Amino acid sequence: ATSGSCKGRCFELQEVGPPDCRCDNLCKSYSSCCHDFDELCLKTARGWECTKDRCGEVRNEENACHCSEDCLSRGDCCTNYQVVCKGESHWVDDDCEEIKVPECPAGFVRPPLIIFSVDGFRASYMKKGSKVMPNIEKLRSCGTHAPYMRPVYPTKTFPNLYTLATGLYPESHGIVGNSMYDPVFDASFHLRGREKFNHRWWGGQPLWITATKQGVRAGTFFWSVSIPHERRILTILQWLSLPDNERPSVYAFYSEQPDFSGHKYGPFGPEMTNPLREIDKTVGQLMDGLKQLRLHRCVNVIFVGDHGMEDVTCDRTEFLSNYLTNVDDITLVPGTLGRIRAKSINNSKYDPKTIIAALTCKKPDQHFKPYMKQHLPKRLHYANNRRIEDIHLLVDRRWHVARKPLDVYKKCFFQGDHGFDNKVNSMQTVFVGYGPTFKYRTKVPPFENIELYNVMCDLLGLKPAPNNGTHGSLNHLLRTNTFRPTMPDEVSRPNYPGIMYLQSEFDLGCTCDDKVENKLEELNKRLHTKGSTKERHLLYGRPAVLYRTSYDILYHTDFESGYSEIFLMPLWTSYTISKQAEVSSIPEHLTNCVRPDVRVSPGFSQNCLAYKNDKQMSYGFLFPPYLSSSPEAKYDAFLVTNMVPMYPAFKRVWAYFQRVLVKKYASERNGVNVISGPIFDYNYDGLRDTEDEIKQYVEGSSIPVPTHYYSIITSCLDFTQPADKCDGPLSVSSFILPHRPDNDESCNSSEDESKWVEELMKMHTARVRDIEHLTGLDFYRKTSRSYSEILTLKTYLHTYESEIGG
Ligand SMILES: *[C@@H]1O[C@H](CO)[C@@H](O[C@@H]2O[C@H](CO)[C@@H](O[C@@H]3O[C@H](CO[C@H]4O[C@H](CO[C@H]5O[C@H](CO)[C@@H](O)[C@H](O)[C@@H]5O)[C@@H](O)[C@H](O[C@H]5O[C@H](CO)[C@@H](O)[C@H](O)[C@@H]5O[C@H]5O[C@H](CO)[C@@H](O)[C@H](O)[C@@H]5O)[C@@H]4O)[C@@H](O)[C@H](O[C@H]4O[C@H](CO)[C@@H](O)[C@H](O)[C@@H]4O[C@H]4O[C@H](CO)[C@@H](O)[C@H](O)[C@@H]4O)[C@@H]3O)[C@H](O)[C@H]2NC(C)=O)[C@H](O)[C@H]1NC(C)=O
Ligand SMILES: CC(=O)N1CC2(CCN(C(=O)OCc3cc(Cl)cc(Cl)c3)CC2)C1
Ligand SMILES: [Ca+2]
Ligand SMILES: [Cl-]
Ligand SMILES: [Cl-]
Ligand SMILES: [Cl-]
Ligand SMILES: [Zn+2]
């Protein structure tokens, strides 16, 4: 029953309970508004601006906004009221002055936060549309800004807004796409439709709930599509005139532009100039209204986008029908990404192995690449949810995938889309912060949108719920912090074992041709097994082990590890390759050489027989023999304690990285420090496995098989100084390579490794923070750098895209 009234209740903040008619900014979407909502709460009379002739008018209540004398007192002047009627200047026309301290009216307990979020606002608009966006450009240059901000995958609207709100990856918050099916529910979820209003889709704790539970009041985040933008601004400004005990501290505004147009005209279509002018106009309204209320040096404002927009046309559609004969057995979630499942789970027929193989490298020009989800690059964090179908298609920028052509012509009207991989430049979006708490005229490096929840909590005095941000990593945006991060404590201390075992105690089936054996180089190799060159091979301290386990630090002339007695292989192996260092080969008599380590018992060692009896599984080394400093030191690289299991297919990638690329990187960057190691993520949750989760061992052994291998490659940002003597900031790139028994992912893998290997490594680029989650290690513990800067460094991603931003 919707028979009450909205008289003096327009946009009430406390949504009331059915049946009783609602007057809040969501009632439209629940068809439950009172009959007089429109009349009272959605006035349009006389438009949204004052003219010289409306000035000092007699308050007429039918007007959408007022230019009457009493209007400041009522809190419902038009945004431009002071300008037109009281000879004031527009906010944009004022010079910008640093806001060193909040300048808040009596009663404001804390600077309010306003989040101005724009759909489809591609990063490069900040430069390319600069001439038509004066307000936005003032915010950007007077406040703090990034050249761009990286969205989450998929680069769709709901996954990204709800990531902004929660600090979580879509796999965790549960909104994993524009549309989705959940099997435990048995239900679907669509942009259109009323199913999406049910609470059970929505995980984590969004900002407005974090605020509420901690005593801070929030304006709504969700606005109804049919409430125009100018009313939404006026509503925020009304709310800001409420009394202290009722007034919210955090507000959001959403724009459907420029996404809406961009889908029609493409990102840079001529029709795109006017949407950008409109957004800007709206921003101007807000800032003018803030200045009327004397809040313009009090409020923190965040101008943030959800995703970008790419050029995409109907004729750049790949059809599953041209790859499969069995197209009726499947369902496709289509578009800029693909997700395939069985059409009927009635069937023990449908087979995912065959589907994938039918979509792998089938046409030279193929504009997509199929994946089981757990083999997606780990940086996408797109797998740990039952709503993510096992089969995924990653689509080339600028293309679509559809099931069949009737699907595209009976179920070209579009020149723009989005949803691609979140490293793609076109998909990048924007960030500006302006206000007392933000820095002044400061550029910051690009960052990921998962990090903002933490900062908005900080801006508000809130303790963040657990999230996927690294709290501290964005402290450099803020003039005044309020959160001071500290390093997690080491949980397991290492053992420093000495020589305890005689070769004859080892029965590992391991042999080496090494018995061609001086007071000079016997003091020498004692210093190298104690830790003399550890100052050049371990540059930033030993990683801390953040869980309970048993492990040994092993020192060597050329490298230091790392060594786990539970997993029987290193957790980490560290080494430095200076610009001048030279590559050698594995001499022939040493090809099959594996040596027992006399610091480590037989029972905590790998054995060579298990590899002999395992026909799928070979082995490799974490510190490469190829980069030995001397023929004598090269014997160190063959220790059984440096060995790890590697599929032959994977050894081709790994040897190329070790033999060619490490040296190339040391050339380009003037020395690199490398840390490499294994990763175990059998349950694809992005988190280090306990031993009882490992699904594969080297046959007949307790030697677990890694899902991935990582490397972190550090040098000096100022590359005129060498890696092992760097005075200031560091530069890093990292990867997490999937440990696969075939190279089906690389369509040119039958060519020389120089044509396909490095391309794979780039696809599987990672943040040091990703590796931390996956290993339970903590890196960069002893540097000269501030911890904040190090957290920034740990969140960096090297993307391999060309010149990007705004
Ligand atoms: C990114 O960030 C996130 C957030 O930090 C990280 O995700 C977190 O990671 C934790 C470890 O994986 C995980 O802990 C689990 O949680 C189980 C219960 O979790 C429920 O409660 C959560 C809390 O909500 C409350 O929060 C505040 C306090 O913070 C309260 O005041 C409020 O009242 C809140 O209600 C809740 O968020 C969580 O939500 C998920 O599940 C819902 C499903 O209905 C979804 O709606 C929602 O979207 C979430 O979905 C994600 O997470 C689930 C897993 O939780 C996952 O399946 C989905 O794919 C999706 O991705 C829950 O409702 C708890 O029971 C777990 O404990 C088991 O294991 C431990 C091992 O030591 C044992 O001690 C324990 O016995 C137990 O085992 C038992 O169960 C086993 C298997 O089930 C069984 O074999 C065994 O025999 C036992 O019976 C464990 O602690 C967090 O829940 C998770 N949080 C979120 C928000 O996802 C994430 O890892 C980060 N990512 C990276 C890459 O770093
Ligand atoms: C169903 C549909 O087509 N649409 C819902 C839609 C997006 C969500 N809307 C919003 O006001 O959102 C503001 C907002 C900001 C931020 Cl930072 C985070 C969230 Cl979760 C929401 C309402 C309009 C577009
Ligand atoms: Ca795991
Ligand atoms: Cl989707
Ligand atoms: Cl191969
Ligand atoms: Cl363990
Ligand atoms: Zn869109």
What are the DSSP calls for 401-463, one per residue? Answer: EES-THHHH-----SEE--S-TT-GGG-B-EEEESSSB-SSEE---EEGGGHHHHHHHHTT-P
- Residues of each annotated binding site: 119, 157, 178, 259, 263, 306-307, 418, 681, 683, 685, 687, 689
Q: How far apart are the CA of 741 and the centre of ligand 5, in A?
A: 8
Instruction: Read off the DSSP letter of residue 14.
Output: S
With a 6 Å cutoff on the Cβ, whether 47 touches ligand 1 is no
Choose the residue to mutate in 201, 229, 254 for probing ligand 2, maximizing ligand atoms within 8 Å of C-beta. Answer: 254
With a 6 Å cutoff on the Cβ, whether 401 touches ligand 2 is no
- 431 strand-pairing partners: 304
Residues in the chain: 806
Q: How far apart are the CA of 624 and the centre of ligand 3, in A?
A: 27
Question: Which contacts of 51-54 are long-range, i.e. CB under 8 A and separated by 24 or more positions?
Answer: 51/84, 52/84, 52/85, 54/84, 54/85
Q: Which residues of 141-172 are buried (b: 16+ CB within 10 A; e: fewer)?
A: ebbbbbbbbbbbbbbbbbbbbbbbbbbbbbbb
- 253 strand-pairing partners: 116
Query: Which numbered ligand comes closest to the C-alpha of 118?
Result: 2
User: What is the residue type of 126?
Assistant: M
- Residues of each annotated binding site for 1-tetradecanoyl-sn-glycerol 3-phosphate: 157, 178, 259, 418
CA distance 118 to 161: 10
Query: Which numbered ligand comes closest to the C-alpha of 169?
Result: 1
User: What is the residue type of 794?
Assistant: K
Q: How far apart are the CA of 543 and the centre of ligand 1, in A?
A: 27
CA distance 92 to 99: 16
CA distance 260 to 264: 7
Which one, of 709, 638, 622, 718, lies nearest residue 671 by Cα? 718
CA distance 5 to 686: 51
With a 6 Å cutoff on the Cβ, whether 675 touches ligand 2 is no
Residue partners of 276: CB distance under 8 A and separation at least 6: 125, 129, 132, 133, 258
Query: Which numbered ligand comes closest to the C-alpha of 417?
Result: 7
Q: Which residues of 339-349 are buried (b: 16+ CB within 10 A; e: fewer)?
A: bbbbeeeeeee
With a 6 Å cutoff on the Cβ, whether 467 touches ligand 1 is yes
Q: How far apart are the CA of 407 and the centre of ligand 1, in A?
A: 38
What does the H/E/C string look like for 130-147?
HHHCHHHHHHHHHCEECC
Query: Which numbered ligand comes closest to the C-alpha of 748?
Result: 5
Instruction: Supply 711's token pair.
Output: 């490397």
Query: Which numbered ligand comes closest to the C-alpha of 740?
Result: 5
User: What is the residue type of 110?
Assistant: R
* Sign of the dihedral defined by the CA atoms of residues 56, 60, 63, 64, in that order: positive
- Residues of each annotated binding site for 1-hexadecanoyl-sn-glycero-3-phosphate: 157, 178, 259, 418
With a 6 Å cutoff on the Cβ, whether 189 touches ligand 2 is no
With a 6 Å cutoff on the Cβ, whether 509 touches ligand 1 is no
- Residues of each annotated binding site for Ca(2+): 681, 683, 685, 687, 689
Q: Which atom of ligand 1 is nearest to the CA of 385?
A: 59
Q: Which atom of ligand 1 is nearest to the CA of 200?
A: 46
Choose the residue to mutate in 149, 220, 222 for probing ligand 2, maximizing ligand atoms within 8 Å of C-beta. Answer: 222
CA distance 499 to 515: 18
Instruction: Spell out where 680-740 has E strands.
Output: 708-716, 730-738
Instruction: Read off the DSSP letter of residue 113.
Output: E
- At CA 468, angle to CA 465 and CA 472, rounded to 5? 80
With a 6 Å cutoff on the Cβ, whether 468 touches ligand 1 is yes
Contact status, residue 186 vs residue 434, Cβ threshold 8 Å: no
With a 6 Å cutoff on the Cβ, whether 391 touches ligand 2 is no
With a 6 Å cutoff on the Cβ, whether 168 touches ligand 1 is yes
With a 6 Å cutoff on the Cβ, whether 115 touches ligand 2 is yes
To which CATH superfamily is domain 503-795 assigned?
Extracellular Endonuclease, subunit A (3.40.570.10)
Q: Which residues of 44-69 are buried (b: 16+ CB within 10 A; e: fewer)?
A: eebebbbeeebeebeeeeebbbbbbe
- At CA 386, angle to CA 768 and CA 469, rounded to 5? 30
Cα atoms found within 13 Å of the Cα of residue 243, Cβ hemisphere only: 1
Active site residue 282: no
With a 6 Å cutoff on the Cβ, whether 113 touches ligand 1 is no
Choose the residue to mutate in 152, 158, 172, 454 for probing ligand 1, maximizing ligand atoms within 8 Å of C-beta. Answer: 172
Contact status, residue 68 vs residue 34, Cβ threshold 8 Å: no
**Number of neighbouring beta carbons within 10 Å of residue 627:** 23
User: What is the residue type of 107?
Assistant: G
Residue with the nearest Cα to atom 12 of ligand 2?
222
CA distance 361 to 747: 6
Q: How far apart are the CA of 574 and the centre of ligand 6, in A?
A: 22
Residue with the nearest Cα to atom 12 of ligand 1?
685
Residue with the nearest Cα to atom 60 of ligand 1?
172
Residue with the nearest Cα to atom 9 of ligand 2?
222
With a 6 Å cutoff on the Cβ, whether 230 touches ligand 1 is no
Instruction: Spell out where 693-729 has E strands.
Output: 708-716
CA distance 538 to 489: 19
Question: By what technique were these coordinates determined?
Answer: X-ray
- At CA 43, angle to CA 40 and CA 47, rounded to 5? 165
Q: How far apart are the CA of 237 and the centre of ligand 6, in A?
A: 54
CA distance 365 to 348: 33
Q: How far apart are the CA of 322 and the centre of ligand 7, in A?
A: 27
CA distance 508 to 511: 9
Active-site entry in 157, 470, 714, 765? 157
Contact status, residue 150 vs residue 798, Cβ threshold 8 Å: no
With a 6 Å cutoff on the Cβ, whether 221 touches ligand 2 is yes
With a 6 Å cutoff on the Cβ, whether 203 touches ligand 1 is yes
Which one, of 28, 367, 521, lies nearest residue 231 by Cα? 28
Residue with the nearest Cα to atom 18 of ligand 2?
161
Residue with the nearest Cα to atom 19 of ligand 2?
161
Instruction: Read off the DSSP letter of residue 197.
Output: G
Q: Which atom of ligand 1 is nearest to the CA of 173?
A: 48
Residue with the nearest Cα to atom 54 of ligand 1?
172
Instruction: Supply 114's token pair.
Output: 């306003």
- 337 sits in the region (left: phi over 0; alpha: psi -120 to 50; else beta) called beta
What does the H/E/C string look like for 474-487?
CHHHECCCCCCCCC
Q: Which atom of ligand 2 is nearest to the CA of 196?
A: 1
Q: How far apart are the CA of 641 and the centre of ligand 6, in A?
A: 19
Quick one: 418 exposed, middle or buried, by C-beta within 10 A (0-12, 13-18, 19+)? Answer: buried
Q: Which atom of ligand 2 is nearest to the CA of 157?
A: 7
Q: How far apart are the CA of 297 and the centre of ligand 2, in A?
A: 27
CA distance 304 to 163: 12
Contact status, residue 751 vs residue 758, Cβ threshold 8 Å: no
With a 6 Å cutoff on the Cβ, whether 265 touches ligand 2 is no
Q: How far apart are the CA of 741 and the centre of ligand 6, in A?
A: 25
Q: Which residues of 698-715 are buried (b: 16+ CB within 10 A; e: fewer)?
A: beebebbbbbbbbbbbbb
Q: How far apart are the CA of 417 and the centre of ligand 7, in A?
A: 6
- 318 strand-pairing partners: 401
With a 6 Å cutoff on the Cβ, whether 657 touches ligand 2 is no
